[PDB]
Amino acid sequence: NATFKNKEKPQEVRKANIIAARSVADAIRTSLGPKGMDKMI
Amino acid sequence: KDQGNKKRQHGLEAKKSHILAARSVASIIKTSLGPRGLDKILISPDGEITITNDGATILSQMELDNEIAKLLVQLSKSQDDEIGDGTTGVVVLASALLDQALELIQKGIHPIKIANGFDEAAKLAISKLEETCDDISASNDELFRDFLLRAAKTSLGSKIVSKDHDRFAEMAVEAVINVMDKDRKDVDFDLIKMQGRVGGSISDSKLINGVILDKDFSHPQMPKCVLPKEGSDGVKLAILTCPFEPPKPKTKHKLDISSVEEYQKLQTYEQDKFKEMIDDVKKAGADVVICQWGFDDEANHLLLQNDLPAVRWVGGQELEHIAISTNGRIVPRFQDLSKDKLGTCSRIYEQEFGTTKDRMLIIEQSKETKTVTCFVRGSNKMIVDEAERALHDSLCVVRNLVKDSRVVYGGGAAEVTMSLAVSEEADKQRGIDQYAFRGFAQALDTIPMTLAENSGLDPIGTLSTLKSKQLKEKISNIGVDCLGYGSNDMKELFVVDPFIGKKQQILLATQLCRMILKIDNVIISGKD
Amino acid sequence: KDQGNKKRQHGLEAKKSHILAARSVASIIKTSLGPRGLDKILISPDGEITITNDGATILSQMELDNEIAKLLVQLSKSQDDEIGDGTTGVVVLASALLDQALELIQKGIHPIKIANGFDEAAKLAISKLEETCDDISASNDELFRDFLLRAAKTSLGSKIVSKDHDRFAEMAVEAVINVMDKDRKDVDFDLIKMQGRVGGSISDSKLINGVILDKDFSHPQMPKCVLPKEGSDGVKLAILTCPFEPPKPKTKHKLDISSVEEYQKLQTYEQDKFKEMIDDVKKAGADVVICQWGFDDEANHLLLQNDLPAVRWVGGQELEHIAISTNGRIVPRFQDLSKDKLGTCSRIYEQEFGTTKDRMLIIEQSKETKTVTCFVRGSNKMIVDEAERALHDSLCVVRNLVKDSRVVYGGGAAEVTMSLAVSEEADKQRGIDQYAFRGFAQALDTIPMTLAENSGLDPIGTLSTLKSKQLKEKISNIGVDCLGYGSNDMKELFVVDPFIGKKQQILLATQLCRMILKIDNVIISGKD
Amino acid sequence: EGVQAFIWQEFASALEVIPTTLAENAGLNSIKVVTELRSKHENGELNDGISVRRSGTTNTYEEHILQPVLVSTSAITLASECVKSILRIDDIAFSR
Amino acid sequence: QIFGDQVTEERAENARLSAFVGAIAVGDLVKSTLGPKGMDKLLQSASSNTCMVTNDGATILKSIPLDNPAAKVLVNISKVQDDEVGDGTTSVTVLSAELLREAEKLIDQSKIHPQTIIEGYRLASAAALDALTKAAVDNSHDKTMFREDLIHIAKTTLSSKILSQDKDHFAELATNAILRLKGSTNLEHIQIIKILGGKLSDSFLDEGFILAKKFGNNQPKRIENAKILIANTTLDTDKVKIFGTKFKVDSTAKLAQLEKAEREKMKNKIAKISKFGINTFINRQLIYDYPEQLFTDLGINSIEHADFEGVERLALVTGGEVVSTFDEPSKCKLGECDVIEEIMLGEQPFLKFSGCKAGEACTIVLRGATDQTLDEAERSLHDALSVLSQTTKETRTVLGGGCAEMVMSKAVDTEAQNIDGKKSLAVEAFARALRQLPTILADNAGFDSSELVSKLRSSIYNGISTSGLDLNNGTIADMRQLGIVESYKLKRAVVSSASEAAEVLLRVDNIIRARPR
Amino acid sequence: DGKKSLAVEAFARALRQLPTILADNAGFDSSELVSKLRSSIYNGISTSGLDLNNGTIADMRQLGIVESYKLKRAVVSSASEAAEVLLRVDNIIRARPR
Numbered sequence A: 001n002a003t004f005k006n007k008e009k010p011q012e013v014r015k016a017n018i019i020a021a022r023s024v025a026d027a028i029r030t031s032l033g034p035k036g037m038d039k040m041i
Numbered sequence B, C: 001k002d003q004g005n006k007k008r009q010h011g012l013e014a015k016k017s018h019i020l021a022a023r024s025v026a027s028i029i030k031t032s033l034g035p036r037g038l039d040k041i042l043i044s045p046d047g048e049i050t051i052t053n054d055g056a057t058i059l060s061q062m063e064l065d066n067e068i069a070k071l072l073v074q075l076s077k078s079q080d081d082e083i084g085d086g087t088t089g090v091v092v093l094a095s096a097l098l099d100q101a102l103e104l105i106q107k108g109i110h111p112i113k114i115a116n117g118f119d120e121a122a123k124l125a126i127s128k129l130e131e132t133c134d135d136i137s138a139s140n141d142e143l144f145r146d147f148l149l150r151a152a153k154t155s156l157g158s159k160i161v162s163k164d165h166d167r168f169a170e171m172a173v174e175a176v177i178n179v180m181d182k183d184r185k186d187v188d189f190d191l192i193k194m195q196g197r198v199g200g201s202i203s204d205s206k207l208i209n210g211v212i213l214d215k216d217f218s219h220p221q222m223p224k225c226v227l228p229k230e231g232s233d234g235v236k237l238a239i240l241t242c243p244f245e246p247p248k249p250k251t252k253h254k255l256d257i258s259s260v261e262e263y264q265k266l267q268t269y270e271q272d273k274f275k276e277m278i279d280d281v282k283k284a285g286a287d288v289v290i291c292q293w294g295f296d297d298e299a300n301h302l303l304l305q306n307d308l309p310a311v312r313w314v315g316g317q318e319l320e321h322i323a324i325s326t327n328g329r330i331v332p333r334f335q336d337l338s339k340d341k342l343g344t345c346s347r348i349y350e351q352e353f354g355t356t357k358d359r360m361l362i363i364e365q366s367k368e369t370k371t372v373t374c375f376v377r378g379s380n381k382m383i384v385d386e387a388e389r390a391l392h393d394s395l396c397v398v399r400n401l402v403k404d405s406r407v408v409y410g411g412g413a414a415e416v417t418m419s420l421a422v423s424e425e426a427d428k429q430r431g432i433d434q435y436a437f438r439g440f441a442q443a444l445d446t447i448p449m450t451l452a453e454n455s456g457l458d459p460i461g462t463l464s465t466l467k468s469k470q471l472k473e474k475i476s477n478i479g480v481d482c483l484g485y486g487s488n489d490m491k492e493l494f495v496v497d498p499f500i501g502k503k504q505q506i507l508l509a510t511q512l513c514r515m516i517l518k519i520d521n522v523i524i525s526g527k528d
Numbered sequence D: 001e002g003v004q005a006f007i008w009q010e011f012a013s014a015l016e017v018i019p020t021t022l023a024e025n026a027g028l029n030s031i032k033v034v035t036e037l038r039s040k041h042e043n044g045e046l047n048d049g050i051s052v053r054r055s056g057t058t059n060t061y062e063e064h065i066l067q068p069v070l071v072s073t074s075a076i077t078l079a080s081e082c083v084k085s086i087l088r089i090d091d092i093a094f095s096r
Numbered sequence E: 001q002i003f004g005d006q007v008t009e010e011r012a013e014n015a016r017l018s019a020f021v022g023a024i025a026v027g028d029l030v031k032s033t034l035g036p037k038g039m040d041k042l043l044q045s046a047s048s049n050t051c052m053v054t055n056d057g058a059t060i061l062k063s064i065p066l067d068n069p070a071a072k073v074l075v076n077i078s079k080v081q082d083d084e085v086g087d088g089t090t091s092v093t094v095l096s097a098e099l100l101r102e103a104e105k106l107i108d109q110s111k112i113h114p115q116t117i118i119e120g121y122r123l124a125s126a127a128a129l130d131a132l133t134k135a136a137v138d139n140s141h142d143k144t145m146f147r148e149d150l151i152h153i154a155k156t157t158l159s160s161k162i163l164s165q166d167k168d169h170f171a172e173l174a175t176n177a178i179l180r181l182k183g184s185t186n187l188e189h190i191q192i193i194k195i196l197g198g199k200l201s202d203s204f205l206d207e208g209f210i211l212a213k214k215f216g217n218n219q220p221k222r223i224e225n226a227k228i229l230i231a232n233t234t235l236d237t238d239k240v241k242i243f244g245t246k247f248k249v250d251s252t253a254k255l256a257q258l259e260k261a262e263r264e265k266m267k268n269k270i271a272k273i274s275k276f277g278i279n280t281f282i283n284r285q286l287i288y289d290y291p292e293q294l295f296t297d298l299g300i301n302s303i304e305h306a307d308f309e310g311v312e313r314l315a316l317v318t319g320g321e322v323v324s325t326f327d328e329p330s331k332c333k334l335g336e337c338d339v340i341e342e343i344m345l346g347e348q349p350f351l352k353f354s355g356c357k358a359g360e361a362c363t364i365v366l367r368g369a370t371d372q373t374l375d376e377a378e379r380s381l382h383d384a385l386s387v388l389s390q391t392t393k394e395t396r397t398v399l400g401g402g403c404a405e406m407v408m409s410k411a412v413d414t415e416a417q418n419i420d421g422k423k424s425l426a427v428e429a430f431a432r433a434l435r436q437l438p439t440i441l442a443d444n445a446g447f448d449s450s451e452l453v454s455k456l457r458s459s460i461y462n463g464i465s466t467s468g469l470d471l472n473n474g475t476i477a478d479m480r481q482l483g484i485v486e487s488y489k490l491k492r493a494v495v496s497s498a499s500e501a502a503e504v505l506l507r508v509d510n511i512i513r514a515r516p517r
Numbered sequence F: 001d002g003k004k005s006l007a008v009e010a011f012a013r014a015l016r017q018l019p020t021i022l023a024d025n026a027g028f029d030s031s032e033l034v035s036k037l038r039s040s041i042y043n044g045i046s047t048s049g050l051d052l053n054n055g056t057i058a059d060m061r062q063l064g065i066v067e068s069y070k071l072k073r074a075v076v077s078s079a080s081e082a083a084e085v086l087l088r089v090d091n092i093i094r095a096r097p098r
């Protein structure tokens, strides 16, 4: 078709946030449950 | 050894990285897949500016250091090599696959076991297509010419060339017919000089039934054009690889001159010797001379007076096309002339160009020679240099159609037939291979969806329609309304992709996946 | 000494440099002379952004190292000091003069002899104006108010304020009448608080017949407004410079406490001591307290219960305006109260402001006090800070009109009358002073011409018209159609510049010239 | 229908991460326990779960694996709300 | 030469550009933070770990560093608008900037003097601003109707922010919280207290007023029919202001006397207070161990440290008066309420007063799942409390959702019929820029803005002057019919505060930066 | 169609900017002059042009201001190509210059 373009695109900022954010709940995943292991900081 | 400056990756991260790196290469070129696609300005570190919707070309130019990308660089490349049209797409499909593969991994699946899953589901799709495809060669002769064209056209819709896609298409169709035979089915691209120069618009891009080359025509006084020389069989021309200069050894020299005796004989030796050649060619009975190497001031003038237009210095591939174009023989010495080894061309003119002091020349033939010269023109370099690669793209899809008259209707539908068929076999799979098959087919869906995204259609929407319609009726070919027009059905719409290529593509991606996945260990060092 | 890092200039170059440097400073501000002028964003090295058509202000802000410019910086400044309106123009005239002076120099004239030429031709113009000028004070009372205004207005046309120039003008007219007397003819600007805050537009800039100050009104419970306290003579208010806290020495302390005896007496000492003050003010019979320094928690509460709104801490100039505004006396100790030294103001309210948690307060009076407070408002800082200086400009032209009711019609015509008269005396001069007089008058012509340039009129054109018309009729006042309207004649148009200022201006430039020209030697060093 | 269904569908699919990572940490076969638990959930109900002890899927209420109902309530309540104030971010300018 | 050492000059063409670009740039930063379908921007200061997400225009602009005058001018205009009305912070920059954009057009490619572009604008503004007043209906009278009016303002002034979700909820809170004052336009009377945990929909306005700081050493954990003495007086070593009083004795015993002597002053003052007959004594100041012990043993509850604002709040819910002189009970309005019970807000001690004498001071408790959500819901609310707080001090109202400005457009686009030559163009441009607001509004939502606004303008063109943009069906429905009212002061402020911006800038023909230090 | 039209109108618009820029340099109120010109060529004539001296709009064929057809045809062409090749760009990549 031929209608509204969205010249703008910081679409990427969202996926970027999600990925740079999901990487957090990653380091954690390992410590869930009676088989979860502790972290040493 | 060299312990420092050496990093290591392995799964937790690693796989994410790679998968993401692919995905990202993709995100750039996805906006270039479609007849609504867009090009990308790439700049050489030297400063060379290019502009092109061609997949391979883009990813080759992106000077990039990520190892996985380096791989997709070749993925689009290899495909360009084997077919000539996949490029932009092969990577898309590949990435989608990876994202998909990864997704499963965080659910407890083995990377290598997903691999085998994909390879399998793939082989299936290849088949479900190899069965639904249609044939052209074996159906008609005037319709073969048409279908063969209706592909070249579809193959150009995603290029700046699109503007005048009628001509550029019928040009590519022709250019190939004229240098490959229905039996050998071999298109040797050395028999097709893809030469382009600036000027006019891309519209003034014609096809030459001979060759071009750049020459001032030896002596200025010489004529500009060349008639078939009264009632003769067209024009005859000399095709010699011997210099119009006094013959010399090839081992030593030192022609010792004891006295005025011999120097007196050399004197008159070179003198009439120039007549020994100028005569020689006249004898074979030719109109114009095309010599590989230059002539002397004397020898040139003679070629003038004797109405023998000349062509000083003509490269290998050059001289050679002038032969095959005009049906002649490449004559060594001078005495090896003869009216029967000449070139039976149909005309020769010195072509003018705006006010450009260059002003090359041309050699026509009227009847389809065994050499074509797609001579591309444009308002500016980039338009040309792109339009040439755009022409090339089509010329390739025309070659693939003789090497395999099989055709599949693209518009995304070709990829929907797989996704549909492959997903069916998923339910029967169950267990682990179920996730793989679902995945493979699922990645595929991104191809049409992306087309919808670029043509302005809701992805999930066009997909459900394309899937339903291509099921509620027959696992046929119902594509995306990429441009509009009535409705789907690439057939009516005349959207066609050569099968042979499509297979290659839907393989090259799964295979490339199958490699990356097997990588669970990485070790990079620096540049000491 | 210090031979190095020390340069020297002298005539060949030198004079060019200086002359040009002036000229260039000029070229910037010329585009700001006129009711069609434009402002200039200046930025402090700290980061402070200002925007203003004011001459002096601009050239003060241009952090500049050229010595001659440094001089024009003060030239516009000094004039601002003495009048308050010249600024933008005084420099223009000065530069023009210099260019002119220079021009002659390359024809063999002595710099110092041109000087005396200019000083002379000048003195003449000053006279030819001092004669053609008109008078206001000695003519009427309602017309004085009008003329005095018709100047303030003309004085504002080249400012952002222009928008609402009706109000800003009648405001400046008033603000001065109310603090200077027809006899002394002295406007002390300490009697006019030029305070401005943000909000609304510049339109919501009113004039306050009292003062403002920022106060929460001591105790929160306190009322917000203050009535004239039933049938009384307006409101009465305490004006004390003594703190509502237990009195203390001013030399030492060490109130030695031998035993519970005396500590028992101090105990009840501070206690009722707070009543000794709270009572004291009640006795003088006042409504509200305006104390220079803060009060204690106790003393405050009491002021509450006793319906005594309070004003903790009020600056010098602050407390002082509250006196002169309300006709009161600045009372030292507490016992020095009395119903006859109070402040007979007409109202007091705690003024709200948008949602700004600040929320200052005000003290009105109804009848024209001996203190005005032009309270400026605007949509953004810069508009305010400019509008305040814009207000100031007019307030000054109103002060100059009482100090010399003489008026000349500007619009450039005022400068044309000189150029005309001064040029006449040129023909009689002959010889060297002829070139000077011609020059002086010629530089002058740039003033109106520049107005034409900015209002979009051909310079040479408007000049010939302004000159012819102001000669073919009478060496009167025919100005430039700066805005349009019917035609020239600043009189009808109501364009007026106070004479007193105009003289100063047309002097300050010639004098400054007279200095620069005498400089034939320069010696600059660096910053070791 | 349409949009709302796909959204919900994924959200439902999301929650399965808790059992998947649970099962994963146990070294158990996620995909196995997932499904074995989905089906066993088709008949059984809010009791059929993973138990590291039993190393498979059994009743997690009878195995005394009790979890305060509030915990899971303000777990999804918070997470689900969080994403919203994240998905709302459409640009990021560094600003000091 | 002249000038020097890094000073930079921008003449005509240059200056004008610097300016235009700046403003246009600023505007194009906050265009997304408008419209009910608008988005938030995340930012982070000198601490890095000090992020924040927001849809408040003025917020973003206030933070974002800039070197460009013209931009700072716009930033600043935002803080102003943010002051006198608490809202429109975005709508103003945008309309301000778009007007400049529309101007460089009339200059760079039409060749019109900026002063004449001002001439036109100044007129267009008159007409525009006018049509507003001339079309703004109010409900000052009928207090039972203006409640419905006022609640709509919050309803819509809250869309676009996170709260747009449970907007209806906060709608009431705001309304009620303002009404519970009905007077003081100073919002410092409403205390907002936030704490993580659970949905925003869990936020509430304790009509009984909550307070932090627990009372007494271990006093009654709940008062009954409380009679409180709200006071602010020195409660750790007196002698108020006699400073210089030394205690020279000739023996430790004479010290021991004077020592218990001081500790007596406390039992004295503490007594003069007990004489006030109260079951609760709140002091702004503190109250050390001993002066407290007294109370713990008299039953009077000691709730110390509530600063200045902390008392004023209590003194408005309970109805008491500050006081610091107990030199005589009575003549001191004592405050009262039904209960002063201690409650717990997610891991925290608080004092839920109840049934106070018409609380003209309230507490709103905000509940979000992350500090980000709170801090934004914080102002996202303030953007409501501020308008409403003003509309009670300006009952006039007008319909937004495009409508308002679109009306001012048809106004200006009309008065541009009687005009001179060039000026007209600036005038037409004004209405044009104004029209860009509903455009940018619809844009963010995702419709073919061009097409939608042209439909809108068409209704408002041909009568109606009520239609607006339903940014959901993407149609153009009746705003008065949809409760999308907006404060008149607000819109009038934008159309004004912006025009000023424009004029101050169009008038610039040079920029000079000095040698920054 | 709908949107397309707009680009079309824009073309003629840009084209019109040529006489504008032409008149601009001369020093006339270009906006005003070109609008006069376009008005004649609008309402028939197709011959009037800009006398960049009286600042009026006189007849060009009447004033010997002919131009090669190849020239103008070239401009209107060579430019449109420029446009298309650029509008089609949705990314730019500079490599590590050496």
Ligand SMILES: Nc1ncnc2c1ncn2[C@@H]1O[C@H](COP(=O)(O)OP(=O)(O)O)[C@@H](O)[C@H]1O
Residues within 6 Å of the ligand: A031, A032, A033, A034, A036, D022, D050, D051, D052, D053, D065, D067
């Ligand atoms: N006996 C168990 N068998 C299987 N799951 C259990 C068992 N006991 C507790 N768990 C799981 O352990 C999970 C994670 O706990 P933990 O790692 O401590 O993180 P948190 O408790 O903070 O979620 C709980 O959600 C619960 O489902």
Ligand SMILES: Nc1ncnc2c1ncn2[C@@H]1O[C@H](COP(=O)(O)OP(=O)(O)O)[C@@H](O)[C@H]1O
Residues within 6 Å of the ligand: B032, B033, B034, B035, B037, B053, B054, B055, B085, B086, B087, B088, B089, B090, B154, B155, B157, B158, B410, B411, B412, B451, B479, B480, B482, B483, B495, B497
């Ligand atoms: N005219 C069209 N209508 C529908 N589909 C088309 C059309 N033109 C090309 N396509 C789709 O786009 C694909 C080509 O993408 P393109 O952008 O040309 O990159 P490449 O061809 O290099 O992969 C075709 O194979 C087909 O799937």
Ligand SMILES: Nc1ncnc2c1ncn2[C@@H]1O[C@H](COP(=O)(O)OP(=O)(O)O)[C@@H](O)[C@H]1O
Residues within 6 Å of the ligand: C032, C033, C034, C035, C037, C053, C054, C055, C085, C086, C087, C088, C089, C090, C154, C155, C157, C158, C410, C411, C412, C451, C479, C480, C482, C483, C495, C497
């Ligand atoms: N309204 C006007 N019409 C004609 N001349 C005016 C008008 N307004 C100001 N002028 C001229 O411009 C001069 C003021 O210039 P301005 O730009 O205000 O700088 P300054 O007043 O600081 O020199 C007046 O003295 C007069 O010569």
Ligand SMILES: Nc1ncnc2c1ncn2[C@@H]1O[C@H](COP(=O)(O)OP(=O)(O)O)[C@@H](O)[C@H]1O
Residues within 6 Å of the ligand: E033, E034, E035, E036, E038, E055, E056, E057, E087, E088, E089, E090, E091, E092, E156, E157, E159, E160, E400, E401, E402, E441, E469, E470, E471, E484, E486
């Ligand atoms: N429900 C809605 N439907 C259409 N327009 C609305 C709606 N709610 C508020 N608006 C519009 O939102 C605009 C204000 O956007 P906002 O992001 O709140 O910026 P500001 O900071 O100016 O409030 C106003 O023009 C108002 O008319």
Ligand code: BEF
Residues within 6 Å of the ligand: B032, B053, B054, B055, B056, B084, B085, B086, B087, B088, B155, B158, B393
């Ligand atoms: F875009 Be492809 F190379 F046809």
Ligand code: BEF
Residues within 6 Å of the ligand: C032, C053, C054, C055, C056, C084, C085, C086, C087, C088, C155, C158, C393
């Ligand atoms: F421009 Be001036 F200072 F009146």
Ligand code: BEF
Residues within 6 Å of the ligand: E033, E034, E055, E056, E057, E058, E086, E087, E088, E089, E090, E091, E157, E160, E383
């Ligand atoms: F962004 Be606004 F203040 F609603």
Ligand SMILES: [Mg+2]
Residues within 6 Å of the ligand: B085, B154, B155, B156, B158, B393
């Ligand atoms: Mg292709």
Ligand SMILES: [Mg+2]
Residues within 6 Å of the ligand: C085, C154, C155, C156, C158, C393
């Ligand atoms: Mg002035």
Ligand SMILES: [Mg+2]
Residues within 6 Å of the ligand: E087, E088, E157, E158, E383
């Ligand atoms: Mg708002």
